[PDB]
From Swiss-Prot, chains B, D:
Chief localization: membrane
Gene Ontology MF annotations: channel regulator activity
Name of the featured protein: Protein cornichon homolog 3
Gene Ontology BP terms: localization within membrane; neurotransmitter receptor localization to postsynaptic specialization membrane; regulation of AMPA receptor activity; regulation of membrane potential; synaptic transmission, glutamatergic; vesicle-mediated transport
Family from the record: Belongs to the cornichon family.
Organism: Mus musculus
Keywords carried by this UniProt record: Cell membrane, Membrane, Postsynaptic cell membrane, Synapse, Transmembrane, Transmembrane helix
Topology versus the membrane: Multi-pass membrane protein
Gene Ontology terms: cellular component: AMPA glutamate receptor complex; dendritic shaft; glutamatergic synapse; postsynaptic membrane
Topological domains annotated Cytoplasmic: 1-9, 84-113
Lumenal side: 31-62
Swiss-Prot record, chains E, F, G, H:
Record remark on domains: The M4 transmembrane segment mediates tetramerization and is required for cell surface expression.
Official protein name in the record: Glutamate receptor 2
Superkingdom assignment: Eukaryota
Induction comment from the UniProt entry of this chain: Down-regulated in the pyramidal cell layer of CA1 in the hippocampus by global ischemia.
Lipid-carrying residues in chain (S-palmitoyl cysteine): C369
Chain positions with Phosphoserine modification: S223, S257
Site (Interaction with the cone snail toxin Con-ikot-ikot) location in chain: R60, R221, K313
Outcome reported for the amino acid change (mutating N315D): Increases rate of desensitization
Site positions for Crucial to convey clamshell closure to channel opening: I194
Other remarks in the entry: The postsynaptic actions of L-glutamate are mediated by a variety of receptors that are named according to their selective agonists. This receptor binds AMPA (quisqualate) > L-glutamate > kainate.
Post-translational modification: Palmitoylated. Depalmitoylated upon L-glutamate stimulation. In contrast, Cys-369 palmitoylation does not affect cell surface expression but regulates stimulation-dependent endocytosis.
UniProt: L-glutamate binding residues: P85, T87, R92, S215, T216, E266
Range of the intact protein held here: 415 to 845 of 883
Amino acid sequence: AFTFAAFCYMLSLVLCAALIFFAIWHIIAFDELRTDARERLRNIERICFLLRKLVLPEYSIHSLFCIMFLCAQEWLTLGLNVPLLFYHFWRYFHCPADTLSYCQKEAWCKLAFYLLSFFYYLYCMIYTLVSS
Amino acid sequence: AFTFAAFCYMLSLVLCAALIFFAIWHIIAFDELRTDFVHARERLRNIERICFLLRKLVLPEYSIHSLFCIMFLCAQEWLTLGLNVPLLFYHFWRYFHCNADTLSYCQKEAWCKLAFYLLSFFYYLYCMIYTLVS
Amino acid sequence: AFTFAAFCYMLSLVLCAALIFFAIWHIIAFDELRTDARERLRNIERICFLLRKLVLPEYSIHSLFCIMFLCAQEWLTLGLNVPLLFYHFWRYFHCPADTLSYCQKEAWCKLAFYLLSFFYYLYCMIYTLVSS
Amino acid sequence: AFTFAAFCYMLSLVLCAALIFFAIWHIIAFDELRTDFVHARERLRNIERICFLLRKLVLPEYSIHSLFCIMFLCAQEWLTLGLNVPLLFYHFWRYFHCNADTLSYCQKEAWCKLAFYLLSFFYYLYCMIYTLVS
Amino acid sequence: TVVVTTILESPYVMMKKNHEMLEGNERYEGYCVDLAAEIAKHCGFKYKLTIVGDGKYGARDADTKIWNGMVGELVYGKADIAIAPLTITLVREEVIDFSKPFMSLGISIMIKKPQKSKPGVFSFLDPLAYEIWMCIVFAYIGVSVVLFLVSRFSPSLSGRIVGGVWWFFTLIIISSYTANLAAFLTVERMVSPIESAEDLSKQTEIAYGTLDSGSTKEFFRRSKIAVFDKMWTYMRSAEPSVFVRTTAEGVARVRKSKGKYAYLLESTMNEYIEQRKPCDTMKVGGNLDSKGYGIATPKGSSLGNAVNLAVLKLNEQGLLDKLKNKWWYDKGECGSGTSALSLSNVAGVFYILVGGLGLAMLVALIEFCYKSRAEAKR
Amino acid sequence: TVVVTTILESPYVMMKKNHEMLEGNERYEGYCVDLAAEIAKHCGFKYKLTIVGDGKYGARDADTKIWNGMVGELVYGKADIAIAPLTITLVREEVIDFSKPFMSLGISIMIKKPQKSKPGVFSFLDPLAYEIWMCIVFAYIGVSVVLFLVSRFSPSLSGRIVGGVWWFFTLIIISSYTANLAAFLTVERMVSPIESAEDLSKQTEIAYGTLDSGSTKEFFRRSKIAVFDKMWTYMRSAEPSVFVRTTAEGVARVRKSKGKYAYLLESTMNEYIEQRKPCDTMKVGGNLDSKGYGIATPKGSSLGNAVNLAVLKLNEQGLLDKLKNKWWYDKGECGSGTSALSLSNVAGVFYILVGGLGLAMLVALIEFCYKSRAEAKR
Amino acid sequence: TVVVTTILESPYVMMKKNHEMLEGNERYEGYCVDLAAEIAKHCGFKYKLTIVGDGKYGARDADTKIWNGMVGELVYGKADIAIAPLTITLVREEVIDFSKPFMSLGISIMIKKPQKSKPGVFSFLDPLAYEIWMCIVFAYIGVSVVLFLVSRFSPSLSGRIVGGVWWFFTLIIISSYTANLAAFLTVERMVSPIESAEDLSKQTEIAYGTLDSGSTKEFFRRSKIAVFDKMWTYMRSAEPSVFVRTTAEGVARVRKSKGKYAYLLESTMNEYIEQRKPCDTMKVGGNLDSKGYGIATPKGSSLGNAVNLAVLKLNEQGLLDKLKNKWWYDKGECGSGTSALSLSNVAGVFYILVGGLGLAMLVALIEFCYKSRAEAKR
Amino acid sequence: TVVVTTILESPYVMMKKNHEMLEGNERYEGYCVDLAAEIAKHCGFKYKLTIVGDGKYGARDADTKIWNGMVGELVYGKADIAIAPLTITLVREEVIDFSKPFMSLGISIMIKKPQKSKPGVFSFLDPLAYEIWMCIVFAYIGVSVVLFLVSRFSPSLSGRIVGGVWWFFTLIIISSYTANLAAFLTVERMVSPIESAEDLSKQTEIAYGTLDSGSTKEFFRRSKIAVFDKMWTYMRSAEPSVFVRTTAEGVARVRKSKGKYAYLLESTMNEYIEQRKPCDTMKVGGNLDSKGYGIATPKGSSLGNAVNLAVLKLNEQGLLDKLKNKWWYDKGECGSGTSALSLSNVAGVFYILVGGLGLAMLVALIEFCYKSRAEAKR
């Protein structure tokens, strides 16, 4: 009933329930930045600091998911994630950091992706638990 | 003769120890403040230091009291818990309920609190006693 | 052959072989201070800093010896140390810190005491090891 | 097929890795220094930084080489040890033996040192090989 | 054609699915049927099968002095040859001509097959009571609270000794858990269930019994072997009665029991039962005695010397083994019938781990909110 | 025929299960029954296994000098032979003729076998010696001191080798504790300090008594020895009354008084009880005295020498030991004769924890009330 | 007297130790000796335990149809009876008369008992399942990630509960590994995958052979079955030659070929070798076929029926099993039938260590060559 | 007375320190001497002690038909009464009048007493080879070096994975040590050395033997008990010869052996040897058989009925037990003859701990010097 795949599902669930909130915070910070002297400069820079800071966690979570579902023989779900790998590579090439449209659009798309992956992981885990 | 209650009671009175100590220290602090209420700067520095300590000595109260309640819950002790809940209710009320006038009210609060905590310490001692030999 | 007393002896040996050197350093620092503007003030204060600092270790070592040889049923040696306990108490009362004579004399006496206690501990340990 | 020597050799070549890396980095540092030997302040800052790093990269050499020798001793390996001792002798001599003239001598020293360390890395690899299957 | 008396014991002789629309020798089926077919092909005769009225094999009575069953049918001309599991015995060899054994067998052991491998989700808490687990949890949180207080109000000599006492505490706790777990695993490991009869004589937890009417107890009685002597002593002074009536009950009572009861029966019947639902039995201990089944025939007959040869020919050709496989294993409804730690023993650990991880993520998110909002904006 | 007079005391003279329907010698069974059977086989005669009337072995009246028991039946012609567990004594041999002892025995100690004792508040220290525990504590505090002496006495290459050696030390200590605790909890060897009567005499915690009416009591009264004299001193000046009036009474007292009572009785009866239910008894030590049961026969007789030779013949043949193993061990019921860890085993750990915690807390409080006082007043 | 012709094959016809000095039947000993003794006791006659000349059991020439062996001695008058392990076959029964099998047996597999195998580079993972190991690794890295996500994603009450749950987790994991490893190293249960001939047929790693001259080989040639046909296919197309020319040769091959050879032979000889020196063999599985040794006697005889009844009488009395246990098990030499931990058991640990170390080192080097490069060029 | 023939067997009859300046009955000393003194006091006679010429007790010869030893002296008037350890036997009772047993005894076991409790200083390294210990040490220092390098030149992703692999490494190492140590301790714990004879029959590591001339083997022979039957089978097929000549050699060969050999002898002699230097023997197993020693006398005598009474009187008064204690225990030269871990098993741990502590203090002192001097002053 466990098969070590339910564990990866649980982990990814706990780990993406943070990314949904992270992306919601991205969206709200974009809404706040929509207002585009020293006061506003600070209100923008102190937030863009955290914005640029909390990018490595995405790499971490995604490499973790990939590795787990790779050595866990969970092949179906890996294909659902490798395109995001190619996207992250094309972003590391050079990120568009003219700058708000792509930001908000990628945030929306990634939020939808994570919100759907949460449900998909819960689904696969509920199926793997009652497989007996 | 352990039944999870002797450990709970002894570990709770160990904390009630510093609880009583902090109540008495607040008593003394408010006493010196009410008595006092270059010399002006000295008094300002002293009151700043004492209030800094007071602020530092708030969270432990809530922490250890919530711990008492949680332990009495997990130990199925349904008489001590009922005696401690009102204090938690009063704390939750204090969050959204609260130099010259504030000092006397805080003095009275600390006095009654010391009385209650000493009573609870003695009750927990007696409970550990007649639960450790039965 | 061990009896848990050889261990206390070994520990006190390793622990007093440091005090002999500490007292030798006390003596050498006193010799340097014998020279009694800003340069000399610093050369004196930076050393008196360590001097006043390294006093708690004496309390520590002595309480350790006392406790060990107390609960180890080693009664003979405890009497060889409790007078030093009374001395430390009379010093904590108020230490004469006019100031160099007592300092150097107590340093000499304590160095001799520790140098003799080293030999005594080695003696008792060699006797306790071959007691079989 | 372990005999305490496979572990020793692999753990020693793992260190020879960064040893070779640091030798090559010293090579590059001395190359840029010899080529260079507001602009004046920039060169001063750069040489200060590089020499600071160099100073930081000295102790590991002695540490890991003494470790190699000690391990080869405790493993009764009496052929590798004899090949490494001369370097320890040279270090002990360097302690009490050592911008324009110093740079070239250090370059030559680092070149020969890189050669020796690469040779020793390959020897240790081959030794782990023909000691792991026998 | 030639009369052939037999018996309705499975799987030797059995009826078809619908024996109402069937007539003649084509009604029956089983090992004995193909055996008789081969014997007919060898000797070249047409036969008619019949069933014994008394449903018994054969034996005398201290007063009647008359052989019953198929043996009686053979003695008194009621049948010209018997093809059935007719055990060979001295008393019977003195009145008929047993052929050579077409099936060698004996007495065996039968037990409830072990398949209990369903460990609880939180079995890892079994070594020491849950009381201790709760005490451990609350001691951990209390020590954390004390360290927090100390390091907060007095920013040592207190931290050092709390650390030392916690060192002692955890030192003893991990070891108290590990040692009891090792005891559990070991005691569970060195339990040789059974490999022979002596494995049962030298123990009394797993009771065992035989039938209340048969040559099994007879073999156990008047026996010299100290093992069987002790076993007869046990079964005779047993309470409740290890002995039982018809085999079906002795089988069901071990089917229900976990590992407490064993049934000593005929090895062949044990193998047959082992290959039938619900497939919760097994035979491991080698046969104790050694007997055989043979094709009988009246003494003053002409087929004995023409039947023994056929039996030996079929035994050498391997036809008998073929038929046994056909009617025991090929027809078997049970074709299928570790040391390490399966995850099932440790699942709860990972469950609580992920629970704590999620709780920590929740706490961190709400703290991030209550901090950033209230500080920067609110 | 011969008048074989005996007495009812198992496992010598036992009534068969179906004794109400049977009327003869087949009713009786036991050791003495087969003994008399073999005696007759040796000599050759007919015997009627009668029973004594008053149900007594043998003695005399101090006033009327009348010999009651089987002694009277032999001396006064009422019987011809007494195959019973008749103890050999000076007085009886002065009037009748005993055979050579067919069963040697003596007084012995019976105690309930060691049950799992109360765990012990500080039982968790048993796996390791005590000096080891003290040495561990002091190594810990000494290492703490040393670590403290490389931060103020010097600013590392000292916190590294110290850390490594401390790692090694604590590793080996954890392992040595876990291994020995596992050994303790796996096998659970049981041993009591009562391996002889000397141990019973030295200590005074567990009591002991004897049947107030019997040669056993008079033996302790008699036979002044540095050990048994002390035991008589004890049992004469000791409350409550340790003596009893019957055997089963003493056995039940031993049972319900599990760990503070022993019973002194014949070794044969003790071995007999040790094999019967509830298998909660055991004989300890060795026979304190040496007595022997022997056949009896009137002074002037003819079977005297014949039976005296038959007894030795059987003793040499190994038949007496055979009958003994039959009626004591083969008949024996006790032929055969893991758990979780409750808090009672490790309560001392939590006691020590809370103690050190409160101590650290007191230290922190008295340190704060000095630090803040000095920072305020100075 | 009677001419009891036999053959020298232990433990049936064995020469006594002092046979050079003795001249008669007392020289011989074994199973068949006591068998003939009891046969005479039943019937009653004098017998001379002679021996066959050519030292063969029995067969015929395809051309001269001459019956060599004991078969010839019985048919050609040279002998009157053959109490020997004479296998019963169709051809022999066509010429002489066999008794009912006094010893049932069959072909069986003999293999050297499982010796301590090579440890295994990664044997230290056996105490725990594999999925458990993967789950442990990933729980570790996930906890690391989470701890990383409460320092940059937030500045604790998150590093506290996480620390506690991780403490619990690693505690239980250490304990579950230690306990199972101790269970493994304490008892050391041995089991081989060869529990039948089916297993031998499936795999092809360990080989097997048979005495190239004997009924065993022809049995595999004959008797086409899905299993034995495959084994004949193997042994016919397989190099080097698995067959042998004698028994002891095959036994020595099994011994020196400890883990890649099995021998197929009579179960009686196998059980005999399993009890003799060096106690380094064991019989596995069950008899593949079913044969029986039976007394022989010329076609027209008088002892035929008498001996045929005596054999069954003994089989029912339990005497044959008694003689077997005597000459196979009581005579048995193998009545009876901790270590340190070498590096070979845990080499994988050091391999993994050095691997991770070199990996971390490469990572650090490529991180430094980027950090310094960016700080210099930019 | 009155002639008294005896034998020179210790401690029954022994000479004084200097038997050259001594004459008469005052020369000898021993149990038998005080026994004869008591018998004289009872019957009121003056006696003269004598020693048997042949140094033997008594027995017939298949040809001479003459009793030898003290039995012969009694038969042929050479002595009027015998006071010595003259065992009671059927053959001897037919020619003399044995008194009642003044000492009941039998056959017992003797073994090398266990006192080996000298564990090596570094025994804690035995669980796993020293190879692994060296590898562990060097892995620790290598990991420390790698961490130092990483944290120095690149002030992460490398530290994290080195920490994880070190976590794995130590996790497996502490467990590999603990489990093997637990196996050692357990296997050493559950070894029941011996408690009876059956404890020897069911094992073959500890050999055992008897004397080459005596009634001991005779009792072992012609015995029904399966235990003694198996023991005779073992001793008869033993190699080397378990049997031995005079008891002194059988004693010395177990004195030298550690636990491999046992000597079955007379219980009384075993108790005597147990109380004599070098005090390296013990008797624990209860007596197997049951025999006794008696005071003999010619058949047609007048003291038999006057000697049996005295023997019984002394047995009841407790004088015989007094003399046995006097000559076995009071005269004994050996008056004296755990589960936890003694420190001796762990001493090396503390040795190396203190070594490392002292090395660290030395390093710290020299570093303090080389730092302060060179920085401030030099």
